[PDB]
């Protein structure tokens, strides 16, 4: 369809052929998942999505620098608490989060790229994605990894700049974008379903606060207090010059994805900003909302004939590398952390067969989960990822932090607090997945107690309550560096300048 022209397929085939050739010859920070989620949330809600990454850095480096002299992830818990129950439970959370926020989302972004590059169904898309993933893995893709990773991040970002200009040239430049966006919505706001009826203007017009990082703290998409605190909590679970470069590349996404995500809504309002349920289905595959098509739609309908194929190939290659790496990590974790514990005999070949069968099992589970991903948190990938992280990680972060700071905590108390935090998190994961989330068009029947609060304020609540549980149970039961610092503060100043500019 979009790439039906010979040139796009030629570049895609050439790129994949070179990737496989290097993989045979053997014998990063940003993937396609973020390139999809950030752009989708930028199209849907404005630019407060970029209020995550920048904030994350201003926390990460702080907790990367203000914790080093005092602390010097799971391995620390292993030394501090000992035993094996906490090891097994942390491995279980790691596997579940890999399935939910690293595997399901990676395949979903893959199906949201092949869907808008060819038009295939979600399953027809992930089937091809996983077939090519298997080809990549069986050809020694992981054997190269770091070898052919830098080059990827030297094009996927670089090419993402080529799109940036191509996106910013079709909106009359940077100044032009900031007038067009507020005045860009759908022309189809009438639904044939009698129950839906006419669609209100609140959730088909772009938000009034689409240009401010600090949204309303009570009625905002990304409340600033929730933003700050929830992100500093979640970032705990998810050399120094490496961190400085990571921050440099972490500042850009606002200009590279979020804003070109904002451009999608104004070049393609009917598709990216669809509000009518059945209209989204014919566009997307789901009737909850489809900003997630923001970046892939922009890539396929904006990039030239020859560079669109290159962008698709690079996105798919990075997604393939991420998926293969996470499959390998999950298999290794399962067959060296949990299954081995269940079977101490340590069979010569069982530890490998069980790894491959686990790989197949998680592939199946994530394929079954894909429908939930495509219709999670109003159809926004970034919101779903951060919601799952807010539901699962904050308890682990609380246990880690109170272990680092408080020496009166107990391993048994730590484990009980961790199970309490997981149970608390499943009181919003399960109910806000089985009952759905829904957009303003079709609000879900979820009780106001559960879905009323933003997932970041739930991160705050769950972190604090999990910490309190851990502490009470533990008590109750039983008894050139100068140059690096200068560059770090320069980067921090630049980041706060960017925050103030878009505050």
């Amino acid at each position: 369809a979009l790439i039906d022209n010979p040139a796009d397929i030629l570049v895609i085939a050439a790129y994949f052929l070179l990737v496989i050739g290097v993989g045979l010859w053997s014998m990063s920070n940003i993937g396609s998942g973020h390139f999809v989620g950030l752009a989708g949330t930028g199209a849907a809600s404005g630019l407060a999505v970029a209020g995550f990454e920048w904030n994350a850095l201003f926390v990460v480096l702080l907790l990367g620098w203000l914790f080093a002299p005092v602390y010097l992830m799971p391995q620390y818990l292993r030394k501090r608490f000992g035993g094996r129950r906490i090891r097994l439970y942390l491995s279980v959370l790691s596997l579940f989060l890999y399935i939910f926020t690293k595997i399901s989302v990676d395949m979903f972004s893959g199906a949201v790229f092949i869907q808008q590059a060819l038009g295939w169904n979600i399953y027809a898309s992930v089937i091809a994605l996983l077939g090519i993933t298997m080809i990549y893995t069986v050809t020694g893709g992981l054997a190269a990894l770091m070898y052919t990773d830098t080059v990827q991040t030297f094009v996927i970002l670089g090419g993402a700049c080529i799109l940036m200009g191509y996106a910013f040239h079709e909106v009359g430049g940077y100044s032009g974008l900031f007038d067009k966006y507020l005045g860009a919505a759908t022309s189809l706001t009438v639904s044939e379903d009698p129950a839906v009826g006419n669609i209100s203007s609140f959730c088909y017009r772009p938000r009034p606060d689409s240009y401010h990082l600090l949204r309303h703290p009570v009625t905002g998409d990304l409340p600033w207090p929730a933003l700050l605190l929830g992100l500093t909590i979640v970032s705990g679970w998810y050399i120094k010059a490496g961190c400085i470069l990571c921050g440099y590349l972490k500042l850009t996404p606002m200009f590279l994805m979020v804003m070109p995500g904002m451009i999608s809504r104004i070049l393609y309002p009917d598709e990216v900003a669809c509000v009518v349920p059945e209209v989204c289905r014919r566009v997307c595959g789901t009737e909850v909302g489809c900003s997630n098509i923001a970046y892939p739609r922009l890539v396929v309908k904006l990039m030239p004939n020859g560079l669109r194929g290159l962008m698709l190939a690079v996105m798919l290659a990075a997604l393939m590398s991420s998926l293969a790496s996470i499959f390998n990590s999950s298999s290794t974790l399962f067959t060296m952390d949990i299954y081995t514990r269940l079977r101490p005999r340590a069979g010569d070949r069982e530890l490998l067969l069980v790894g491959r069968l686990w790989v197949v099992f998680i592939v199946v589970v994530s394929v079954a989960w894909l429908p939930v991903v495509q219709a999670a948190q109003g159809g926004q990938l970034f919101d779903y990822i951060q919601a799952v992280s807010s539901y699962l990680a904050p308890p682990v972060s609380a246990v880690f932090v109170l272990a680092l700071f408080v020496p009166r905590v107990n391993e048994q108390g730590a484990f009980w607090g961790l199970i309490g935090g997981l149970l608390m998190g499943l009181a919003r994961l399960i109910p806000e997945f089985s009952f759905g989330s829904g957009s303003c068009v079709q609000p879900s029947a979820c009780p106001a107690f559960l879905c009323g609060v933003h997932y970041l304020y739930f991160a705050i609540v769950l972190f604090f309550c999990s910490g309190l549980l851990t502490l009470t149970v533990s008590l109750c039961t039983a008894p050139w560096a100068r140059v690096v610092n200068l560059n770090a503060l320069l980067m921090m100043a630049v980041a706060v300048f960017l925050w103030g500019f878009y505050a």
């Binding site: 100043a493 706060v496 300048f497 103030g500 500019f501 505050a503």
Partner: peptide, 30 residues
Amino acid sequence: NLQPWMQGLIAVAVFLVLVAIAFAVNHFWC
């Protein structure tokens, strides 16, 4: 109604003040 660059410069100045405080505290006592 401060311009965006006013807000950016204000943030930079505030952070530089905080950095000066954090440098003076350890300049005075460990």
